[PDB]
Amino acid sequence: DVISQIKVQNNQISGGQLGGMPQAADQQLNASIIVQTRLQTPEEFGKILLK
Amino acid sequence: ANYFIDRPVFAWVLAIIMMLAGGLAIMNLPVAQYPQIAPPTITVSATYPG
Amino acid sequence: VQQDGSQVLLRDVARVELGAEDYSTVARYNGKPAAGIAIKLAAGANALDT
């Protein structure tokens, strides 16, 4: 359970782009989406939710 | 050296051999705009969709 | 498959279309859609006959 939770909560989820090819006409916004990033400090690791 | 003056046929034969070798070279010699000037570089490309 | 019995298909939830792999490039030749190829020659080859 600990290994699976670490794998789930220490991932590199690729959100994508808020408006990207093929985009709609008259589209005037383009930005990247950030969902998750890999943890960096033991304090963050110790806060992983097991249950 | 100077001994070709006594033997014109040897000089003419050498000239003919040179011309034939040059024609053979021109027949099969690679041509290009420029030779390999840039140092070799290797490119590694990876894609992570999204 | 629902309890009613009607079959749920992919076309019922999505649009399936023969599209492109990479959509992030618009290539136009004189304003018209186009695609190109670059030929990089070989070593020991004749650039004229090639």
Curated annotation (Swiss-Prot), chain B:
> Could you give the subunit structure recorded for this chain?
Homotrimer. Part of the tripartite efflux system MdtEF-TolC, which is composed of an inner membrane transporter, MdtF, a membrane fusion protein, MdtE, and an outer membrane component, TolC. The complex forms a large protein conduit and can translocate molecules across both the inner and outer membranes.
Q: What is this protein called?
A: Multidrug resistance protein MdtF
Family to which the UniProt record says this protein belongs: Belongs to the resistance-nodulation-cell division (RND) (TC 2.A.6) family.
Q: Report TM segments.
A: 9-27
**Location of the protein in the cell:** Cell inner membrane
Induction text: Induced by EvgA, probably via YdeO.
Q: Origin, by domain of life?
A: Bacteria
Give the protein's function.
Part of the tripartite efflux system MdtEF-TolC, which confers resistance to compounds such as rhodamine 6G, erythromycin, doxorubicin, ethidium bromide, TPP, SDS, deoxycholate, crystal violet and benzalkonium.
Which parts of the chain does the record assign to the membrane side Cytoplasmic? 1-8
